[PDB]
Each structure stands twice: as structure tokens, then as C-alpha cells.
Amino acid sequence: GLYRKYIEYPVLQKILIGLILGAIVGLILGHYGYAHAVHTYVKPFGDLFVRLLKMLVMPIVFASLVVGAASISPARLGRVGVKIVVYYLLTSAFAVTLGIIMARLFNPGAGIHLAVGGQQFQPHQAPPLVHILLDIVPTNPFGALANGQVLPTIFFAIILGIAITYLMNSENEKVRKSAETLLDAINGLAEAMYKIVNGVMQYAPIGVFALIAHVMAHQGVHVVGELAKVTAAVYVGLTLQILLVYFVLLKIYGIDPISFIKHAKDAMLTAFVTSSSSGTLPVTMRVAKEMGISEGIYSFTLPLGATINMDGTALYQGVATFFIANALGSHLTVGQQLTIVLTAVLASIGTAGVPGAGAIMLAMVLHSVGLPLTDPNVAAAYACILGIDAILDRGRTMVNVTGDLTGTAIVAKTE
């Protein structure tokens, strides 16, 4: 009885109730010194929610790209393929430098007290540029899928989808029949994961309550007291300028920006709370069909950008890099400035759709400039931003969904 009424209630309204209620509970318990109780009991519910999101990432990226590539003729795929990737990279480059310019302009936040605390080990070492490019080709298609390789999975999935299109045009009857059966089985898998995503989203209000309450109990209230500069800079930076960057581009091509945000408003809110771009992928598909985009375009452009187009994460890479540098007191000249821009674009590509990938992947960007994590002072500052990661995680996922959706609208208008 009561279980049913909990279901028909709209999902988005439930999340805001959980997020707001979680905020109140965390502050009260933290003030009375019950943080230890929250860590032992409340936290495990939040941990389960995170593990559910990581489960869906790989079965959905492989299946969606195979179906997306197989639904476009090879001639049309080349034209849309080159245009979508160039938009993705250029906005990524602009996103990194946008954080760079105002980080110098805004207060760097050098003044901070640090303690050794916990230390990270084995800092991520950057291989030579030729080596990371040759690793896109999977030496074992099954091994890359099982061993948590994302970039090789995309490379193999796209080729497999293109090869199926050639088979469905073959003269032999047996070849066509077997090619259709293979595509249907993969398509059925892709549709199944969308149903599981809806099922997981029903547990999200409980999961968001645990994750949010845990933050303020330990250190969440400290954002206003200290480190207000780093949290304000990303919010004044990532949210504001990039949304109007979308506004001007749509105006140039003749599309009204205010109509775009109204139709896609639900996409940002679901990405704001669940922290996963891949988890919100089915919602973006629902938005696209109502907007009027043809089926062939967004069926392929949207899945590809869920792992490639991540402007929010790229911006976050630049601002956090200076925060580590300012804490150490070191100074970076233009030579390190260029290296940050290049590595941040590469680093944003390597991240997956899981929420917490931003912090772990950031080791590549810092190591390129220097200051390895073996330094306890570097580790001390690095281990601190992990606490405020959850609050800043929400901003990064939100804009990435719009950045993916913005490109499809621009591209689809061209044809």
C-alpha cells in the first residue's frame, strides 16, 4: 500500500526533499558531536548508491555505441563524426583556459593550514604521448571490456557497429539474417540497462540523504569558514560563463536559447543530484526526441559525448591544480600554463561517467607540472579537497550533460 504511493510520486521532487532534509540532519548532529555515529551507520547506505552507479557504466557504453554507429550510413557518419569531435575538443580547451584566467584574477587561496594526515601512494605517471595513443587500440577486445578499459571499449564498439552496416547490405541471405540477429541482441541489452537505471533512481533519495548528511557532519560546515575561495571560484566559474557560452552559440545559428533550457531543464536537475552523467543518459534521450532532433543524429552523438565531452571536469582540473600549487607556495610560469591546458584536455577524456573519477584522475594533471603525490605536503593538500569533492561534484556533471546536448542541437541544425 504505502510502498506504491512512494513510487508514483515524481522522482525529481523526492530527491530535493531528501537533499534538503539531509542537509538539516547533518548540521544538527555535527554540532552535537555525533559525527562518529553518522560515519558508522549513515555512510554505508551512501556507499551502496555509489557502487550501483559504477555497475551500469560499462554495459551501457558498449551497447549504446554499437547501436548508435549501426544506425547511421557510413557516408553520413563521417560528416557528423568530424563535426561533433571538433566541437567537443575546442570547448574543452576553452573550458580549461577559462578557469586559468580567472583563477589568477580571483583569490588563489594560498593561505591554508595543513597537516600530514593520510598520504597517497603511487602517483599516476604520464606515459609518453605516443604510448597513450597506441593504447586506444585494444590488444584483446574481451580483455579491455573486462579489465575496466573505457577508451579501448569505445574504439572497438564503433568499428563493430560500422562493420554490421556493411553486412546488412550483403547479397547473401544467410549473412543478412545473422547480422540482424546480432544487432537485435545488442540492442536488447542496451534497452535493459535503461530499465535498471530507472530502478536505481528510485533508491537515489535514500542514497543522496546519506551522502549529503555525511559531508556536513565531518567538514561540510567549514566551507564558509575556510576554503570559500576554491568553492566559490568553481561555482562562479563553471556554472555562469559556460551556460552563456552555450547561449551565444545557439543565437549565432538562429536557435533561441531560452526555449532550449526550458525543454532541457529536467536534464540538468537530474545530473545535478545523482552526480553521474551516464546515469542520466536515458533522461537526455527522452529530452532529445521532444526537442525535435532526428533519431539518427542524437542516437549516436549523445552516447559518445557522455565519455568525451566533459567541460565541467576539465575546468575543475585547472582550478584544483593551482590550489595545490598555492598551498605549497610554488609559482608557475607560462611554461607550466601550457602543459596544464594540454594535460587537462587529455585527463578529461580518460575520466568515466562515475561521480568520483575527478579526484583520482587529477593525478595526471598535477604530475605533469611536478609536485608528485609522494610529497607529504602535496598529499596533505590533495587529501583535503577530497572532502569538498562531493559538493563540487554536482556542478561538473550538470554542465557536461548540457555540453553534450548543446553540440547535438548545433550539429543537427547544420544538416
Binding site for ligand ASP (CB under 6 A): 275-277, 310, 313, 351, 353, 355, 357-358, 393, 396-397, 400
| 351 near Na ion, judged by CB under 5 A | yes
Is residue 92 packed enough to be buried (19+ CB in 10 Å), middle (13-18) or exposed (0-12)? Answer: buried
Q: Which is nearer to ligand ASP, 92 or 313 (CB)?
A: 313
From the list 98, 179, 230, 349, which residue makes contact with Na ion (rule: CB under 5 A)?
349
By CB under 5 A, what part of segment 224-253 binds Na ion? Answer: none
Residue nearest to Na ion (CB): 400
Q: CB-based contacts of 238: which residues, under 8 Å, 6+ apart? A: 99, 312, 315, 316, 395, 396, 399
Nearest partner of 194 among 107, 290, 278, 319, judged by Cα: 278
By CB under 5 A, what part of segment 257-296 binds Na ion? Answer: 277
Residue 91 binds which of ligand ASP, Na ion, none (CB < 5-8 A, kind-dependent):
Na ion
Q: Rounded to the nearest whole angstrom, what is the least distance from the CB of residue 316 to ligand ASP in the complex?
A: 8
Residue 276 binds which of Na ion, ligand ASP, none (CB < 5-8 A, kind-dependent):
ligand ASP
Q: Which is nearer to ligand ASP, 164 or 404 (CB)?
A: 404
Residue 355 binds which of ligand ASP, Na ion, none (CB < 5-8 A, kind-dependent):
ligand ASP
Q: Rounded to the nearest whole angstrom, what is the least distance from the CB of residue 53 to ligand ASP in the complex?
A: 9
Stretch of residues binding Na ion (CB under 5 A), selected from 61-69, 82-90, 219-227, 365-373: 82-90
Residue 349 binds which of Na ion, ligand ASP, none (CB < 5-8 A, kind-dependent):
Na ion
| 389 near Na ion, judged by CB under 5 A | no
Cα-based angle 353, 280, 245 (whole degrees, multiple of 5): 80
Nearest partner of 22 among 200, 201, 210, 217, judged by Cα: 210
| 92 near Na ion, judged by CB under 5 A | yes
| 393 near Na ion, judged by CB under 5 A | no
Q: Which is nearer to Na ion, 96 or 373 (CB)?
A: 96
Place of cell 550483403: 170
Cell of 319: 582550478
Q: Rounded to the nearest whole angstrom, what is the least distance from the CB of residue 351 to Na ion in the complex?
A: 4
Beta carbons of 35 and 29 less than 8 angstroms apart: yes
Residue 393 binds which of Na ion, ligand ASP, none (CB < 5-8 A, kind-dependent):
ligand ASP
Alpha helices (H) along 106-172: 129-134, 141-146, 151-167
Place of cell 563553471: 238
Residue 183 binds which of Na ion, ligand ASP, none (CB < 5-8 A, kind-dependent):
none
| 64 near Na ion, judged by CB under 5 A | no
| 309 near Na ion, judged by CB under 5 A | yes
CB atoms within 10 A of CB 6: 10
Q: CB-based contacts of 360: which residues, under 8 Å, 6+ apart? A: none
- Phi then psi dihedrals of residue 389, to 5 deg: -65, -40
Q: Rounded to the nearest whole angstrom, what is the least distance from the CB of residue 282 to ligand ASP in the complex?
A: 14
Cell of 340: 596544464
DSSP label at 217?
I
CA 275 – CA 117 distance, rounded (Å): 27
Q: Which is nearer to ligand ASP, 164 or 363 (CB)?
A: 363
Is residue 93 packed enough to be buried (19+ CB in 10 Å), middle (13-18) or exposed (0-12)? Answer: middle
From the list 287, 404, 406, 407, which residue makes contact with Na ion (rule: CB under 5 A)?
404
CB atoms within 10 A of CB 246: 22
Q: Rounded to the nearest whole angstrom, what is the least distance from the CB of residue 285 to ligand ASP in the complex?
A: 16
Q: Which is nearer to Na ion, 326 or 397 (CB)?
A: 397
Beta carbons of 280 and 53 less than 8 angstroms apart: no
Beta carbons of 305 and 407 less than 8 angstroms apart: yes
Residue 309 binds which of Na ion, ligand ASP, none (CB < 5-8 A, kind-dependent):
Na ion
DSSP label at 122?
S
From the list 311, 325, 343, 358, which residue makes contact with Na ion (rule: CB under 5 A)?
311
Residues that bind Na ion (CB under 5 A): 88, 91-92, 277, 307, 309-311, 349, 351, 400, 404
